[PDB]
Each structure stands twice: as structure tokens, then as C-alpha cells.
Amino acid sequence: TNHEQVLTDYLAAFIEELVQAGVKEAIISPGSRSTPLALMMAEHPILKIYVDVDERSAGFFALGLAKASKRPVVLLCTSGTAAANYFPAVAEANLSQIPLIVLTADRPHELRNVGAPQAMDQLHLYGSHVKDFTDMALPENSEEMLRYAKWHGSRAVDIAMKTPRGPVHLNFPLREPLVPILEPSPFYYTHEVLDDSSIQKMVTECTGKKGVFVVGPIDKKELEQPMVDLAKKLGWPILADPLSGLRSYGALDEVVIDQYDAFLKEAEIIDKLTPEVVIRFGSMPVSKPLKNWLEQLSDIRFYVVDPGAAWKDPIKAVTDMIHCDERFLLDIMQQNMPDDAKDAAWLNGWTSYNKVAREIVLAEMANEEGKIVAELRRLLPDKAGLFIGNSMPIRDVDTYFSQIDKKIKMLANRGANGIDGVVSSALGASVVFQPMFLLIGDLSFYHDMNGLLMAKKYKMNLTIVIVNNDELDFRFAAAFYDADYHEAKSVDELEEAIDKASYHKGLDIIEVK
Amino acid sequence: TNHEQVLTDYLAAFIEELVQAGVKEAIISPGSRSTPLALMMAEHPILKIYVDVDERSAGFFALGLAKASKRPVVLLCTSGTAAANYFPAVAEANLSQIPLIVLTADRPHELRNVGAPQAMDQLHLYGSHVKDFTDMALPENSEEMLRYAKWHGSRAVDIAMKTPRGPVHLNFPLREPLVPILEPSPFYYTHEVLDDSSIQKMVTECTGKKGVFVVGPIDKKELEQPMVDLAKKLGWPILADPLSGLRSYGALDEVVIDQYDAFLKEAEIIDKLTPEVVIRFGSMPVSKPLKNWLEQLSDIRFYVVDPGAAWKDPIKAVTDMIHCDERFLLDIMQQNMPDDAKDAAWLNGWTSYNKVAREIVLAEMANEEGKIVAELRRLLPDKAGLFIGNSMPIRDVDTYFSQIDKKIKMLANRGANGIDGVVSSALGASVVFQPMFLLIGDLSFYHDMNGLLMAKKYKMNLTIVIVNNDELDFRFAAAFYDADYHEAKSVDELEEAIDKASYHKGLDIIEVK
């Protein structure tokens, strides 16, 4: 019934439900108004905490951690411009379907839009870029209002984790004094399914047709193998994006095509490889010549599998929009599509151009923006993570990273793209996948340079490769963040750097000028 | 009539009107979609350009430049998360009434919300935090549409510069190819006034009353002297904020009170200094004991002068809201208020506590977070600029920076406050006021560390004083950005650092641990 108890009961009810609904990590930024929420989250036994004093960096850190783990991740910042720094990562989380619980501390009603210090309008702060907005009540501790606090904690995580996944924003007006009572201590998975009538139409329509699988960047785990099996069963090629995982799932394969970016630039190859059906999985692939090829082809059956109804199709090519779970579709197609449907000449044609274009690529790579990918492909461990920057590193990983027999989790921010926040993204992802590697340009590296503090203060393992095409001497940046600096001037100098980097748990930075 | 000419005619009409309406500077961030707008702004003869690759830093740079010069300043970035990085500075510009023309490049309609790379929803991106939003047409070059492009260029700057001043957002959908034709080359002030009936009511109501002037952070230039004259004429004290300019306008004074933060904490002094009227100018002062004092007093006449109708009053103390120009009000009060109204005992009481509290402060400052302000007060030139960070440096400049007889422009981000972007803010302001000094905490310095690139690549003069109260060794940061590093361990070590800093045109950084 006293002010500080009221504040403690209210927040504890909320925070307890977040953890009980699956939040294990919180990414906190400090400030006056965020203090009571930060202190009480710290007191929670199960809940782990990371402190990032740059809110922009905190947002991308949370993003990367939630993208890699499929876990809902809390953000917490104070009132004022701090909340606005979450915006780039929230917009990214929106488009890449990443479950961020963004909690913004705020002034109380008597201090809202009144000219108070550290205070701005935080109602619908991120606009359409969140799944849900809640302006929470001022702290109360009645039976009704405590259950309300629990209810909103459960709803936040549920909405964020329900497909299509995405960011959820909760605004907390907090009235002074913000001193909580810490002594004594205050402390169902659904998927989309197609109908039996609806699967029969699809099965019959492409039962003996020349089809192509197109897989772009995809979220879901262990979808590599059953996809490979189906394409093998049908005799269909898979045009696999580097971010699909099919180019690095730990096995060599007879259906995965990886040189399509090269050979679809040529006009006669465009004509000869013309399919009857196309089935898309995941986002759109990064390849512009593939994009232009899929745009050009008409009078085909263009399926896209989109369980979240996000309507990602910048080509407007869709004929049949499929709103179901990817693993479900692959399994029913593995059970119901015939075995005797195999045309050997169809797959053969695709694999032939693929073998030919591999030679054209490998004839040049014994001489450096393409050779850096090729050297990285060989030097990487059998189980590793690779975050790729959105500039030139993503176009060169499409050309010079063919299929390898190592398990490599490849991650990029492919929603709203952008050169911002990719260091913190990689660093958040490094909590899940080890060892973590970052192929990055100099512009992106500078942009999110101060996110390297998280690697220093939490003793994280990340190997950074900077393609500096370009006035900046990055040795001083390395020394500042306690990083081991390496300058690779040759192919052999890169080999020594990678070997040294995997040898110690810590931050490594390899600059290639 | 051809695509690239259309694009050139459209943008040139817009850009020409911006310059013709008073835009002299543009702050550009690079990218694919921003390229045609950036190239053509570069071709404009009068328009000066600054390139900031961090969009967050660019926003605060523009903010600082526009705050210092009262000039409208263009921002330009590419599509995607780049636009979202402008948000903290836009929210700040909104509350601090700063005229930013924010231009965001965008995908065309066929690539909007369709799953395209580097693309997000940019309609009403900043929400209520801008004065105006325009989604511009796709480039056309007809007589109607070219005048439309001119019209929007004039409207943008006008709305941004009309009081209450603020940010204006224009979104530009641009269709590929984005290659402009650069060869050959494509290239009233109103103020609020009170009525004669309305001034007579105010003049008579405080014609012989014990009144107090309260001046917080204020925009308007040369408002120092006529304010001083009126308070001298009336025998009224001025409780001047450090950011009012009255504490450093180049003259010592017999009405400016600067120790109110100290002596209004005491209960009997609160009671004895009780006025009959209060007149506020500018924003709310940073002093919490002054805030609490003005809150506590009742049955008074509380005037606030607010020409922009922003209603800045977190105390809700207003009795008479005055919507007119500050210079106008001071001049008519200088002409119409009587001379024989002077009560000597009223001003005497205020100046007495002020003299007493100065002794209490100066008795301690011969021994370091307060002594750093006091040393800075003495060591500064006769004509200088000082940007202050929003953390502990603003509370200590209120206590330990009494009135000096030097002209010092003092600047802070006092709208939405926040520890973010104050380096770029100071660096933008450094274009106008020279020499520029920055008193800053370590948290703020880290937050906007990468804004120091602007000091390096444009060879700017800024002296940074870091109050490191606190793992980071800032020498490596200094070496990275070509800055002269100084470590001040004593009072005399600070003197040597300041002397060296003012001696060369370039970036200086003084750390006090």
C-alpha cells in the first residue's frame, strides 16, 4: 500500500511473466527512469543481463541474439532520445521477423509533453514497425492491476513469438521515487497446416513438371536435409542462397546449385533453363540476375511459401501463395509426390552449367575481394558461425562461396538491410554460435565500432575480417577495445591470422587493405 | 522527356528552392538511393556539403549547426534503416525548436512494402516529432510538376523556420536508373506582437510589485543586454541559467543571480525571498531546487513568455501565458514601465544571499568535478563557445559557473536531453562559434565517439574535456581520430592542456580521471 512496495509488486508481476513465457536474456541501457526495471531484472535468479550503454548497439545486439537463438529477448532503456535509438533495430526486427520485447521507461502523465527534462512523446514511438503497442498503467498493486501486469507480460511474449514473429513495444510511465524494495527478494507451439483437398491440387499440378526450388535467407533450423531429399526425389535443382544454409550444412550434394548468379547473366542460358513451376522458400535471394530471371519468366506456376503472410515478392511473380509451415510442406510432399517422376535430363542441364561456371570462377582465384571469401571458405572450422555485412561482402559470398562439407551458420540482416549495427548483431549472435566470424566492410565497421565494448566487457569470441577497399588506421581501434590486431597483406598472412584467431577465446580483427 | 532528364529537372527545381529559401548547408549520408540527390546538391554552386557516414552522427551534426546559426540545415540519407537513425536528433530538434529539413530517399511505389532489399515503410517515419510530412511524387518534368517541386522546397524551409521552429520530413521515392545529367549544369520575417489593451493590463499589474525574472536556456541572439537593462530599471533579480547567456555575455552585472541552485535548498531562504510576480523566459532552468521553489509558491502572478505556444511548464505554475516575441516584450516594458518603482531592499536581499553563497562555493574550490568547471571558467578566451553534456556536467556548471566578464556562447541539448549525440552536436556548432569547447562525461563521449571523424576529415577545431569518473584508455581513441591527447592529473596540468589546445586549429582531447 506504500509507494515503493506498489512499484515493486507491479514490476515483479510483469518481469516474472516474461521469464515464465521464455525470456532468458535482457539487454539493458542505463538511465534515471530505467533504474527500477533494471534493478529488479538483475534480482531475478534465472534472467541473464547484458549492459549496453549505446542504445543503438543494444538494439542490434538483442536482434542478433534473438535471430540466432529463436528466443524472445528484452530491451530496456530510459526516457527520452534513448528510446529513439532502438528504431533502426526495431525496423529490422519487423522485416526479418525477430521477436524483440522493447520496454521503454517513460515520465508519468504529469510530466508528459509538459517541457520536462529527458522526456519526449513515446506513444506509438515506432509506428507501424511493431506488432503491438501498449502504454502501461501507472504502477498499482491491487488484485486486478497485478494480474493486469502479469497478463501483459504473457501477451507481449506470445504476440512476439506467434508467427509472423516481430517486435513488441511496451511503454512504462514511472513516478518518482524510483527506489524498489529488493530486500527481501520479490521473486504451446502452433503451426500453419494445409487442407487435404488443398495439398491434392498442388501435388497433381507439379507431379511430372520441370520444377525449380528457390531458397533464400531462411529462419527455421534443420530444414536443410528434408529439402535436399525432396529435390533428389523429384529430380529438381535447388538454387540455394548463401544464407539458406544449403551451401554449408555439412554435406556435399547433387541438387544444390550455387553458381546461378554467374550463369543467369547470359541470355541463351536464361532461355534453355526455363521451368514449368517454381517453388520459393524464405526471403528473396540476394542475386539480382536470379531476381531478373524469375521476373522475366511468364506462363509458369510460381509458388511461394510464406507462413507469416508477409507477402515478400518484389517481383510480383506469385501465382500460388502458400501460407503454411515449411517443414510440414516438405514432409507431405515427401510422402505424396511420386518417385517415378524423375527426368534425368532436367537436373543434368542445371548441374552442367553449375560445373562449368565453377571453373570460370576458380580460374581467377589463384592470384582480392573475391579471394577473401574463397580463403575464408577453406579456413573455417567444421562447425562455425559467419555473420556477413550488407555491402559488397554479400554479393561476393554469392559468387565465391560454393557448397562446402562443413556446418556453417550464415547470418545477415536482410530485412531493411543497411550498413548499420552489424557488429553488435554478430556479437549478439556470438552468444549462440561458436566460433563466430564477421566478414565486414570498413564503412559498416566504423558505423557500429562502439559495439565492440560488448566483446571487451563480456569477454566474447568474435573474429572480424575487414575488407578495407577505401584514412583510418584500425590498429588504434583494436588497441582501444583490447582486440588482437592482424594486417593481412597476402594469402598466407590471412592463413596465419585465422589460425591465431581460433586459438584464443577473445576479440580478433583482421584488416585486408 | 527522357527518364534521366526527368529526374534531373525534378530534383533541381526542389534543390534550387531550398538554397533560395536560405539553406546553405547539407549533411549527406551515402547510399544507393540517395546518390542522385547527393550528386546534384554537390553540383550546386552556393550549397556547402558535409559527408557523415553515420546517419545518427549526421543528424546531431545538423542539429548543432542549425542550433548555432539559426539557419535551416538539410539532412539527406538513403532508403532503409538509415532514415531511422535520424530519429534521436529529430525528436531533439522537435523539442528544442531547431529547423532541420530531413530528406529521406526511398524505393518507388512498385518496390514499397514488397520485400525489396534496403526498403522499409517511411511514411510518417518520425510520427508526431516533425512539424510536417510529405511523401513527394515520383519524378515528373511537366510545367505543373516542376512548380510543385519548387513549391515544396519553399514550403519545407518556411514551415521549418516559422515559429515554433522545428524539423520537416520529406520522403522521396526514386525509380532506377538513378543517374542524373550533371553535364551541362542544371543550375519575410514575422514575429508575435501583443495588443495595446493587453500590454496595459500587464504593465499595471506589476507596476510596483516585488518581481523576479527567470531565464532558462534560450535561442534568440543579443537578448542579454535589454533584459539586464529592464531588471536594473525595475530593481528585479534575474535568476539566470548557465544556458541563458546572462552568466557570460561579456559584462559583470548587479542584477544577475547565479547561486540560486545552492541557497534555495534552505527552508528559511525559500520563505524570505517570496515574490509577488514571476516572469519566465526560455525553457525551464536545469536547477531542481529552483524548480521546487517555483512549484511551492502560490497566490502569485506567474507569467511565462512562450512565442511558439510550446507550453513548456512541468510545474503547471502558469497564471498568464504570453505568446509574443521576447525582444518586443522587453522593449515595450522598457518604454512603458515606471522608473520610480524601485525598491532597493528587494534587490538587496537577493544580491546578499548571492554574495554569501559564492563564498561557500569558493571556500571549497582550492583543493574535482566542481573545480574543473571553475578552472574552465578562468582559462576560457574572451570570445568562445562551450557545449555542455547532459549528465553531471550540466548540474556542476549551475553551481560552479558564476558570472564572468567574457562572451561565452553556452549550448546544450535541453529538449529531450539524453547522453547521445553531443560530440556531433558540438562539432556542428563549431562551424559557427570559434573556439569551441566541449565539457563532457565518459559515457556521452563513448556514445558519440565516431562523430570525431567529422573533426578529422573536415579539419575542425574543438577542445574536448572529459570528466572520466568511471576500463577504457582514451589515448587510443585520440590517436585513431588524429587528436592531440592530454591527461590532466592536476590543476596545473589542465592549464598546460588548455594553453596547448587554443594554440592549434584541430582536435584536442583532455581526460580528467
Swiss-Prot record, chains A, B:
Cofactor: Mg(2+); Mn(2+); thiamine diphosphate
Annotated metabolic or biological route of this protein: Quinol/quinone metabolism; 1,4-dihydroxy-2-naphthoate biosynthesis; 1,4-dihydroxy-2-naphthoate from chorismate: step 2/7; Quinol/quinone metabolism; menaquinone biosynthesis
Keyword line: Magnesium, Manganese, Menaquinone biosynthesis, Metal-binding, Thiamine pyrophosphate, Transferase
CDD domains in the record: TPP_PYR_MenD (cd07037), TPP_SHCHC_synthase (cd02009)
Cofactor binding description: Binds 1 thiamine pyrophosphate per subunit.
Superkingdom of the source species: Bacteria
Gene3D superfamilies: 3.40.50.970, TPP-binding domain
Catalytic activity: isochorismate + 2-oxoglutarate + H(+) = 5-enolpyruvoyl-6-hydroxy-2-succinyl-cyclohex-3-ene-1-carboxylate + CO2
Database matches in InterPro entries: DHS-like_NAD/FAD-binding_dom (IPR029035), MenaQ_synth_MenD (IPR004433), MenD_middle (IPR032264), THDP-binding (IPR029061), Thiamin_PyroP_enz_TPP-bd_dom (IPR012001), TPP_enzyme_TPP-bd (IPR011766)
Signal peptide: none
Molecular functions per Gene Ontology: 2-succinyl-5-enolpyruvyl-6-hydroxy-3-cyclohexene-1-carboxylic-acid synthase activity; magnesium ion binding; manganese ion binding; thiamine pyrophosphate binding
GO BP annotations listed: menaquinone biosynthetic process
Similarity comment text for this entry: Belongs to the TPP enzyme family. MenD subfamily.
Chain's role: Catalyzes the thiamine diphosphate-dependent decarboxylation of 2-oxoglutarate and the subsequent addition of the resulting succinic semialdehyde-thiamine pyrophosphate anion to isochorismate to yield 2-succinyl-5-enolpyruvyl-6-hydroxy-3-cyclohexene-1-carboxylate (SEPHCHC).
Quaternary state and interactors: Homodimer.
Protein name (database record): 2-succinyl-5-enolpyruvyl-6-hydroxy-3-cyclohexene-1-carboxylate synthase
Protein species of origin: Listeria monocytogenes serotype 4b (strain F2365)
Encoding gene per record: menD
